[PDB]
Design a protein around this ligand. Structure first.
Ligand code: HEM
Ligand code: HEM
Lengths: 406, 406
């Protein structure tokens, strides 16, 4: 069975600095292969990438499934966890999506730009009088958390718990891989269920609310028969998943955009002169360095990709970094050129049913934050020679530190 | 059942000149309704538009299906016609699409730009010395036919039949509603089958060819077991369908782009000054005036759209003009502003499985021809007050004449 080139290692620091650098030789030489250290098939070319991400009937998304402990099944039934937005397919995934996507529409997200700018200025006021700061937790992650809280429309008193909402979730994801012992398992799962019940109560209270918050936007969705389009359990679980899935991705996006603007100062000045380039500064970043460089699916039958035969039930990962940097679709795929004619023509948000629903917000945040970040501290320059601090993760390399000065 | 505002009439001249003008009041007031003069459901909002265009499992494409005459079934079996790319759904549509998409990739389409530019200059040289011309057939339609012949890589000696390929096919489409009488039916269907057999022979001869032309690109697709991925009959039928679906659409795109550049001289000057804007001149045109302003589907079960319940088996049309001009997705939806940040964020090529596969070519053609047209004849001005000549059709309003001067 086909193997992988030597330079292809998603767990190396070379992947943490540039996920697409390890994928060029692989895509060129072995477009579809098998990765044994992860035990999954690997697809790199954009054609096959879009095929796998689109054909849901052939490449299902059932690959992820946490298990609920026994003592919490009275408050959080296992079917609720089985209704995870990442672990469902039509007709259930479409039923959940028709409600989830209703909250990220332009009339709902556009009125958040002034709030994002205001809170970003408030955050910058905390360290604007110094000479340098750790921009990751102090700005990027902080601004993402505040933007998600504004989308949820939650008071600052609930800010701690909301942060915990992501810290718990990742641990839950690791449970199938590094099982938790007691009393860590009970504590983590109880905090998870507590956040779930908090969102449950918020949905029950905002069930007939006609406001901008995603809770009221998803709760007020009633079918022709008056019945709620999504049960309260499903809405609460999807709110938890949205909170946990947006924060790290958007924070990594902002960090990578800061890095790219530091490595390309002329594009930074050009973007400082015209605001309409900021979105492009977004789009070229997430294309060149996607926050989630891997998208997982599972085959429902036997497939043939690039002549390689893949048996039924085989987990297949699409390397979004290889697809976004395919020379067969974009000229100079490794360059950071914000002046491309088709900026949003990438798979950084995948494609099809499981397309990233938080893309309208993230973009706006990326368009709003970076500008403000380069409007308050213009000579912001990423400190060279700072030890790379990355959480060793394959699907989502999270940067823990990024020292910047101005 | 909900009706439509008075101004909504797809068969009126107001729709032929601007398909989005009849859709604004409808989209705002009655987003999903029933049109009795056509007997079909109408969906206008972009939110529901993407769902209907994407959810193939709920909104199938089986609504269109011509019937094969009896005497030609020995040369053109009815199952071959049943394998029409517009009348199939997964798993057959995926099998056909995996082969069709291989011919429109960037490495295949990009080497056609210089040929398109050269042939556009050759065409302009025929009438550049006059003072005015009918730009539709002399340039738009001519350039589209020559571009399709270059994609097929056919000699000019094959120009007549190829032209006939468009004249015949539409009549076949008109058979399901306005049946043909004798002896025209036999002659037209024999010409259709003759073109089908010509493409069959071209596929058999280019079966082992490794060139860029769509015939060799689709014919050389063989699975891991050496067998052809698609039978020769289906490849020939798909070539016929590709020509017939590209010609009129790209010609109407170019005509509408000429009209929009005439109505906005500052954008025309900006595009003349910078080549990178020509593509945007494309994208803003096809957004403001899509060549095919309606996309048809058929429901497989009962659906709920905007609270309106639509029974199973109901033909539903998505008004692409209303979706591309939805104020819920784009600000100032009726203006022709080529300086938008997200130019390709429209449904002019729909979305999902049945997305227009010729979009890479059309764009390339639209950017290449028009530019040359405004590089040879810069002071081109569309003659005001000329009787609008449109073939009275709902799914594809084709303009028959457009007099221009310079
Ligand atoms: C620039 C930042 C972001 C990037 C690069 C990004 C990227 C992605 C990727 C790669 C996926 C996987 C899709 C798949 O597996 O097919 C995804 C899904 C998802 N994203 Fe994001 N995302 C970002 C921001 C956000 C935000 C801000 C939110 C919410 C506020 C969000 C919520 C979600 C959800 C809920 C899913 C699951 C969709 C589903 O499975 O149905 N994302 N995103
Ligand atoms: C800007 C110019 C064009 C426009 C506006 C346009 C419009 C469209 C639209 C809206 C669809 C979607 C039909 C559906 O959803 O079922 C479509 C399908 C299609 N288009 Fe185009 N088109 C254009 C140019 C072309 C070109 C140059 C080709 C060359 C091959 C082409 C070939 C096709 C084919 C074969 C289909 C059927 C796809 C399928 O059903 O699988 N079109 N066209």
């Amino acid at each position: 069975r086909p193997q992988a080139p030597s330079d292809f290692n998603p767990m190396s620091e070379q992947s943490f600095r540039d996920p697409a650098s390890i994928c060029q030789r692989a895509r060129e030489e072995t477009p579809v292969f098998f990765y044994a250290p992860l035990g999954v098939w690997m697809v790199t070319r954009r054609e096959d990438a879009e095929r796998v991400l689109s054909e849901w009937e052939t490449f299902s998304s059932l690959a992820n499934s946490p298990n609920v402990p026994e003592e919490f099944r009275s408050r959080f039934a296992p079917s609720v966890m089985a209704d995870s937005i990442v672990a469902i397919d039509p007709p259930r995934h479409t039923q959940a999506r028709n409600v989830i996507q209703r909250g990220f529409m332009k009339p709902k997200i556009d009125p958040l730009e002034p709030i994002i700018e205001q809170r970003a200025h408030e955050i910058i006021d905390r360290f604007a009088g110094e000479s340098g700061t750790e921009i990751m937790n102090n700005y990027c992650l902080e601004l993402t958390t505040r933007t998600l809280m504004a989308l949820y429309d939650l008071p600052l008193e609930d800010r701690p718990m909301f942060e915990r909402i992501r810290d718990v979730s990742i641990k839950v994801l690791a449970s199938v891989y590094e099982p938790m012992q007691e009393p860590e398992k009970s504590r983590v799962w109880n905090e998870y269920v507590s956040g779930y019940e908090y969102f449950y109560q918020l949905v029950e209270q905002r069930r007939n609310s006609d406001a901008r918050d995603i809770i009221s936007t998803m709760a007020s969705q009633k079918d022709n028969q008056g019945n709620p389009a999504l049960s309260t359990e499903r809405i609460a679980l999807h709110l938890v998943e949205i909170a946990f899935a947006g924060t790290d991705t958007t924070a990594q996006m902002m960090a990578n955009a800061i890095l790219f603007l530091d490595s390309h100062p002329e594009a930074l000045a050009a973007a400082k002169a015209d605001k309409t380039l900021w979105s492009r500064v977004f789009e070229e970043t997430v294309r060149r360095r996607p926050s989630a460089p891997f998208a997982g699916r599972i085959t429902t039958t036997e497939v043939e990709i690039q002549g390689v035969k893949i048996p039924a039930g085989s987990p297949v990962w699409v390397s979004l970094a290889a697809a976004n940097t395919d020379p067969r679709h974009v000229g100079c795929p490794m360059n950071f050129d914000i002046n491309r004619e088709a900026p949003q023509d990438h798979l950084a948000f995948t494609k099809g049913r499981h397309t990233c629903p938080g893309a309208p917000l993230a973009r706006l945040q990326g368009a709003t934050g970076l500008r403000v970040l380069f409007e308050r501290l213009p000579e912001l320059k990423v400190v060279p020679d700072q030890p790379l601090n990355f959480a060793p993760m394959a699907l989502l390399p999270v940067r823990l530190s990024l020292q910047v000065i101005w």
